[PDB]
Amino acid sequence: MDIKYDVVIVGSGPIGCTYARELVGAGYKVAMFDIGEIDSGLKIGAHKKNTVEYQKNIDKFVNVIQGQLMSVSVPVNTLVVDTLSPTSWQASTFFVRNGSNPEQDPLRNLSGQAVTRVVGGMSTHWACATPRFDREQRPLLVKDDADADDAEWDRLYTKAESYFQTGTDQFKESIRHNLVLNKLTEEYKGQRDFQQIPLAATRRSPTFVEWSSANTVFDLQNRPNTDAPEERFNLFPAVACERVVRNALNSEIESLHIHDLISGDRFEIKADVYVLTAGAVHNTQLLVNSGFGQLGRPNPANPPELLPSLGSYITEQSLVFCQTVMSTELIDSVKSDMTIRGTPGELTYSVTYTPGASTNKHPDWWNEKVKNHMMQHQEDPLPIPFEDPEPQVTTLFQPSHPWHTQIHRDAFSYGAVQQSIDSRLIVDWRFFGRTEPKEENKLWFSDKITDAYNMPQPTFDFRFPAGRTSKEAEDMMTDMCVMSAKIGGFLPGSLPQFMEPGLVLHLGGTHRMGFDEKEDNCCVNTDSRVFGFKNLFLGGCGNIPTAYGANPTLTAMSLAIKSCEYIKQNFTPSPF
Amino acid sequence: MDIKYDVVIVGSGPIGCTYARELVGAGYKVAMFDIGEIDSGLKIGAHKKNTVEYQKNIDKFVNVIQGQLMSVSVPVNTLVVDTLSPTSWQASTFFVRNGSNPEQDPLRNLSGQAVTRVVGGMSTHWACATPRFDREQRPLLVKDDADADDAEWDRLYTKAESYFQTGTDQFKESIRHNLVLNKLTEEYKGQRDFQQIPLAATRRSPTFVEWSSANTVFDLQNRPNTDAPEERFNLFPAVACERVVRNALNSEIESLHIHDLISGDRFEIKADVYVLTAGAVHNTQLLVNSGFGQLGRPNPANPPELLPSLGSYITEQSLVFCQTVMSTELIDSVKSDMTIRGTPGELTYSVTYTPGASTNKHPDWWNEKVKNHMMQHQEDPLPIPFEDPEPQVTTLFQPSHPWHTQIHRDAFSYGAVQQSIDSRLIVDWRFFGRTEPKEENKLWFSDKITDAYNMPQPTFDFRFPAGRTSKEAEDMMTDMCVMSAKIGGFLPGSLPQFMEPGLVLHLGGTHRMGFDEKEDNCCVNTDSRVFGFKNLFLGGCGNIPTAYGANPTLTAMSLAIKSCEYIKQNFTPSPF
Amino acid sequence: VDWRFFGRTEPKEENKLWFSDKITDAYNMPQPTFDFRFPAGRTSKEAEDMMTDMCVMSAKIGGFLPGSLPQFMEPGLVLHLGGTHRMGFDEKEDNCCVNTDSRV
Amino acid sequence: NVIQGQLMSVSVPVNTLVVDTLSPTSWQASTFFVRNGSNPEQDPLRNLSGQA
Ligand SMILES: Cc1cc2nc3c(=O)[nH]c(=O)nc-3n(C[C@H](O)[C@H](O)[C@H](O)COP(=O)(O)OP(=O)(O)OC[C@H]3O[C@@H](n4cnc5c(N)ncnc54)[C@H](O)[C@@H]3O)c2cc1C
């Protein structure tokens, strides 16, 4: 291991890979550290759902997600167990057991918040939705010039969409996708617009989608190699990055202190440029362990030297969720162009349609698939083919419906096992609220309790803000009940509900961006540089300082691309 | 991909890897096909539990196991869902949905039986116990000379133990381990012997154990390579092997028909020698899809042409399970050698002991750990150090207790512990019964229903035989209840229970071994060669024809090694 | 607060309560058996609109209580069964069993 | 609880729950036979199961 690099990046998630891709491509000598390990196959940091086996068994992937997500702050457990044998060791109090955080108020938690420590980060298992934010949800990159701001976000998002391979066409021939898209489009005609979820993914075959991940952005292979002979990059897995060292004037970072988990050694790594992309919780943890913000229970009667806004104004979206079972009417409509004669299972049975008929409700491709299904599987009571891909439908956030929507099927940590109802009938509904940033909503770190890597234990003090955020969240639940009823009734066991705070994993604003540190109550500027420091940049959702409802990764990636522009304007790569 | 090899092996679990180690090492040109993919990291087919993150969070590994195990035969669901919306599409019958198997009788199933399709097979997540079988559980390799049989088994087991890196001291300095071991040793003094579970694992540090896997047997890297310039091996993942092609005379296999899951193309591969190691279920499926045994619901009115015993005489172990919470008396004895001054937390707190004082009940390595724990964590009410390794205690199968026992902690698809009771207190009890082989106990394949890979759907017809197997199983339950109570009372939520048939995953006898095809009712001889065929061999637990309680993998491995000795004597490597 | 919204069901000849000629109940009388589905058309469409109306209405008072989320209850839990010996003016014209004096 | 106690179900279909974890020595059913008051005439999917 070299001990000198041009650029060091902490975290190998898709935002650290954005910095790699830009900086390695421009000739910088780059090192990347991840506390976690290469597990995902020969494609380093690739999506774990890209196996034939998972794509044949997509519900099983929930268990993989559950397995790698580690809860961020678990309050002390107060469950009463009073049927132990009288001989068994029995506690007298609810003591600190099994990694729990006694700093945590159980009623002001994001109990669902969790992290993933693996090479590629959460992109090894995310659901790949990458919508753009409209102006109302998005921070300003240019003030007092809206068309210039729009133009800058358009250039960055388009680039970001190329890195992720974002598209809106991978599900265009699914019968279920079109059944639901067309119905919603018709019902809301001229009030709301429906489209495919923009997905970071490339379809390889009718039954397989290559989901994008960090690996798609940057392949994570050591360089130089035969494909990039003039580039320089080294990834170091199983390395915990613990602290950046500030110079005495707080104008520069002088080193990164690391802990190699396999050998035990602890080193200082020196770079020209330090990039932190360890996630919204862990960027904040590393900064606070390095003398930024305030360690310990916040204490206003004692102002921090540096970055007083760090870990305040945190935002996390409200999530409401339900599943439906498709209406009898919609399922009958699937075979509306068909002529069916005879009884299924006898030689006289047949299913035909008129190709190209002007008054057909469906296109020939749909009707051929129905026909074939019904004719080859005459025991099956449904018209939807067995390997039909899932619906992937959205109506994006608008002023009149200020929440993001997904009307689809995919794997999340809270997916349930359902066996009794045919899966072809079931559609998931996920509506995502925006949360106003408030100073009182905080991520802070204990000065006593440490986590499993011996770093300061994360602690949340969070409630959804009263006012607009809470009114929108309840309106959004109503919207989901109203809209979902157009498609079918709720699936028993997946009735409409707010999910545990944080489960949606879209935390932002922990190290937030703005034009001016004091006036905009922020930590980094629009180049993602930490105020006061020449050579320290932060990337990730933590930078986003606005109330958003749409999934944030694409936006965070776009900020990282602008950040790399600034780096390339201000630091020169070492000669090879 | 060449079309011609010396040896082809179907399956990359630890039994396939045994054939690979032996034959690639003896110079054969070998190819290995697996239907699943490389996921586990840059060590191909390595144990997934070997990440720093799993080992700091071992309870999460349960979720990984759940995600990768796919149920073999799921009967048609008959749960009544009568609270659907009146608008939702509603069933008239319990039709076949969600991959269920309409051939399956739900009351004669191995409902717990499941398979893993990944490179390395189940060894990417197993619990690494590798006991030898005593005479009573083991098939004869030598007729009419018990001491020669014994010597041949000892020679094979000792190689197998070398391949797996089997050891019995990786847990020797665990407090919890020794606390349980010592107490059980004393309670059964002169009646039963206790020891460490033999485990395929190597300890690397006080907090890290490298669990063994297929990778340990053979690293699965293509050859020739720098480290092995004279060897020849190619691994082809994501290739479903579908049929071995019999010659018209039923004397030889002429090719292996494969489906490349990524390109979609179907090929025939030629080899001199064909080795099937796809697991006890899928070896059987592949043979039946190739014209061996009988396809469809068994029909005596129609003897099959070849291997009439294929899929009959199947065995699976009964499994009883509970968890206990450590007794107060045992917990108090952990600290019996300590001198304690004053009062925890308070200034003057000191904990000491006298190294070597024969009045000590415990060794110095133990007291040093207790002492350090109690001084560095004075708030914690227990004297077991937080990083203490798990217990791994067994008393092996004996005539007077004819069941294998594990008294330990490890990750399985069930048995997830929880957060109310300190995990240092908890011990798992798994007792495993032996099941008599009976002809009427069968694994068969549908002639109409197919599985997710379009192969004949496996179907079980199984009950624990009445008589000894059933009597033993109930005696085993009582034995667990009596034994467990010397250590602590049951943990609420893990009370003593029989586990669902097949969850233990120790299925045997589906393609069983013997001396004589007809007199021994078997499919392969003691070289693992399919009767009548020159060039077809099977490996795995499916070979074992006896009633066994212990974990079968080491025994399967031993038979594979004998098989390789036959192959080496009877086929010549192509020139290199 | 509890929210209970009750829909009306169209009377359909095919929805029946009949009694076994073989199986008996606890008092040695013919075992009741149902053959029932909510009629498609108006009854079903109203019932779903009624669900939506409860979600829209209840939200004005508060959000759902976890563990008591909006759901259809098991058919008949409501115990308002009717029409098993129905009233009308004319036995044949009105497919009924009793007249407006409740006389058979 | 008073109410649940006095309400007797009018037609309970034959139960077809799978209990496959009985001890091997326990008496075990080969079919889903008529148990504990259930009604074999009743189609489980066209019932008023809450009628009592
Ligand atoms: C199930 C699921 C579904 C999701 N769906 C979507 C969606 O559809 N759309 C969307 O936009 N987002 C979604 N997300 C969220 C998305 O995955 C994250 O926003 C994204 O991965 C954030 O990227 P990142 O690079 O900032 O952080 P991460 O991906 O979290 O990567 C940060 C990394 O740094 C590491 N690290 C942490 N601390 C240290 C340290 N001290 N030293 C060294 N390394 C460290 C980690 O091990 C990790 O690799 C989903 C995620 C989940 C789990």
Ligand SMILES: Cc1cc2nc3c(=O)[nH]c(=O)nc-3n(C[C@H](O)[C@H](O)[C@H](O)COP(=O)(O)OP(=O)(O)OC[C@H]3O[C@@H](n4cnc5c(N)ncnc54)[C@H](O)[C@@H]3O)c2cc1C
């Ligand atoms: C949680 C867990 C705990 C366990 N603990 C223990 C224990 O402690 N000790 C004990 O002895 N064992 C235990 N086992 C069982 C042990 O893992 C198996 O006995 C062992 O892996 C069998 O080895 P194998 O090589 O025969 O088969 P497998 O490991 O099942 O490998 C068979 C392989 O062949 C493949 N395949 C299947 N069909 C095809 C096909 N048609 N074409 C091509 N490839 C195919 C698979 O994808 C797979 O990789 C445990 C299992 C699990 C899941």
